[PDB]
Design a protein around this nucleic acid. Structure first.
Lengths: 247, 87, 162, 27
RNA sequence: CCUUCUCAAACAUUCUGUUUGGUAGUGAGUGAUACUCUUUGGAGUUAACUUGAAAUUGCCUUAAA
């Protein structure tokens, strides 16, 4: 049922998106052109939060470096607006709880501020990459059979080598250098992988489970920040242990 | 560094190493994002996990008392964050 | 059977929404649990054992206490269950508050009131002076029980039900 | 087979890609 | 049943100093004084007042089932 309250609720939520990103684009107007006459600041940042809560500021100034992306829900009240929904649509992160790597250059960088209040983000580590691919990933493959609107788990080196015969690649651990040390264009490695579907940190609608659900609503509602300023600097966290749990 | 035999076949890796009489044969798979059979029960194997896991626990406790050792061993963070292995 | 006008004024209660709102409010005001008092008084116990008190707030729920708040008069809104084991107990409240111009509100169930208070039951739970945060939500709330309950329901005073 | 004997097999059966002993199970 | 742009660079090393930036509202109505404008198009601006967030018709789905 509509639950008329919910109606207005969604509305105001949606508005806080629009007016936010709109401002952001106008910042993206004056950080595109260096047309600044009077603005807040022309320099972007990244806000690095680590754990009692120890914080700090930097600037990316790339220097391409991969951001690690883990999508989790938020802010629960909102209809996706256009530009957010598309900029995600590239990363196909709708049908949420989809983890993915993204290399961040400074043409990757400013497009973030739309994605900021959706995925939680941070530079990964080795064992997070190898460990996160070793348990997950799927390949859409056709051969010998299979008109195939169907996805294949990763075992067969025949498909590993075979589809990677372009780049002269066997043994997806090669992609590790392609990723960990960020190999050539990096792109077809991850487009290849058909990136990832996490299991939610704690399942739900149970007795003791419901507790943990609340505790998550606590810590998740604190460590996930925003400015909503259009000057909002990006948030970065240490995702390693996060993926000790989530995967 | 006390081991005896190694076998491999289509299923993973069978390592075989002896302790003082009773002699050990065990297994490690070949790692892939290969899915779960989505049928067979964990519960039986989850309580095999409870008890057998505890066995493992003390066995390695009393087992680090073999010479003298700190049970369980400390690990360095960078090891796991980077390697995450027997290193 | 035909039931007297002073009864059947129960059975007329607050809707899904307005009740839902009332608890949107009071669920702020849960009178602190027992382990709570043990908490704060233990911490301060150690503090003043080695090493400035705003007036605490809650809802005032003692039945005797509640009728005591009224007739002074103190209170602002009163919540009255529809089911009391000796149904007798509350029969005079809706009249009383009436003559005293107090916003009484019938909310369904004594478990439902009893749960906001850290008890098994209340059948009456009410508040008078509230923090300023929700003071507007109060003024509007009582305006809503006036407007919903009070307004068109003068009819309940006559008319044997059943 | 390094420990199937204790020999440290020389590199002649080895030094890829020449053939290696195919499996040689312990049993 | 929604939760709010809580900071920047620059300059000079002084337990702080200097400097430039960065902020669009709930609405309704009181109104005596001006500025400014442009061809009637009245546009942007000028003291300071009342108000229960009051009223009437200014062309992603684990926040499930």
């Amino acid at each position: 049922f509509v639950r008329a309250e919910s109606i207005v609720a969604k509305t105001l939520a949606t508005s806080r998106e629009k007016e936010r990103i709109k401002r952001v684009s106008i910042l993206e107007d004056k950080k595109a052109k260096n047309e600044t006459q009077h603005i807040a600041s022309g320099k972007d940042f990244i806000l690095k939060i680590t754990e009692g809560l120890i914080r700090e500021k930097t600037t990316y100034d790339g220097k391409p470096a991969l951001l690690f992306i883990v999508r989790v829900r938020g802010p629960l009240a909102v209809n996706i607006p256009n530009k957010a929904f598309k900029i995600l649509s590239l990363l196909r992160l709708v049908e949420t709880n989809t983890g993915v790597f993204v290399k961040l250059t400074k043409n990757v960088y400013p497009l973030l501020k739309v994605i900021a209040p959706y995925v939680v983000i941070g530079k990964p580590s080795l064992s997070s990459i190898r460990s996160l691919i070793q348990k997950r990933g799927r390949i859409i493959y056709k051969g010998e059979n299979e008109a195939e609107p169907h996805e294949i788990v990763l075992n067969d080196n025949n498909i590993v080598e075979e589809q990677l015969g372009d780049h002269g690649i066997i043994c997806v651990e090669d992609i590790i250098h392609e990723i960990a040390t960020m190999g050539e264009s990096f792109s077809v490695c991850n487009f290849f992988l058909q990136p990832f579907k996490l299991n939610r940190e704690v399942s739900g609608f149970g007795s003791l489970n419901r507790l943990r659900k609340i505790k998550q609503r606590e810590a998740e509602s604190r460590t996930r920040q925003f400015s909503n300023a259009a000057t909002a600097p990006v948030i970065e966290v240490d995702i390693d242990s996060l993926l000790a749990k989530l995967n | 560094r006390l081991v005896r035999k190694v076998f491999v076949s289509i299923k993973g890796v069978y390592y075989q190493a002896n302790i003082k009489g009773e002699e050990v044969r065990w297994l490690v798979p070949f790692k892939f994002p290969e899915n779960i059979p989505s049928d067979v029960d964990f519960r039986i194997m989850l309580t095999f996990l409870e008890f057998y896991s505890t066995l493992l626990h003390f066995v390695l406790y009393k087992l680090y008392t073999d010479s003298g050792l700190i049970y369980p061993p400390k690990l360095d963070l960078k090891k796991d964050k980077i390697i995450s292995g027997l290193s | 059977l035909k039931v007297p006008p002073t009864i059947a004024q129960f059975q007329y209660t607050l809707d899904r929404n307005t009740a839902a709102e009332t608890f949107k409010l009071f669920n702020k005001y849960r009178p602190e649990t027992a382990a709570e008092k043990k908490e704060r008084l233990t911490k301060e116990a150690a503090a003043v054992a080695e090493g400035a008190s705003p007036k605490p707030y809650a809802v005032k729920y003692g039945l005797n206490h509640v009728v005591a708040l009224i007739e002074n008069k103190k209170a602002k809104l009163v919540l009255i269950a529809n089911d009391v084991d000796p149904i007798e107990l509350v029969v005079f409240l809706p009249a009383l508050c009436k003559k005293m111009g107090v916003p009484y509100a019938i909310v369904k169930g004594k478990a439902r009131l009893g749960t906001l208070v850290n008890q098994k039951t209340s059948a009456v739970a009410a508040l008078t002076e509230v923090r300023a945060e929700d003071e507007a939500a109060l003024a509007k709330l009582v305006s809503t029980i006036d407007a919903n309950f009070a307004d068109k329901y003068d009819e309940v005073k006559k008319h044997w039900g059943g | 087979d390094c420990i199937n004997k204790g020999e440290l097999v020389p590199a002649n059966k080895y030094l890829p890609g020449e053939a290696l002993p195919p499996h040689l199970s312990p049993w």
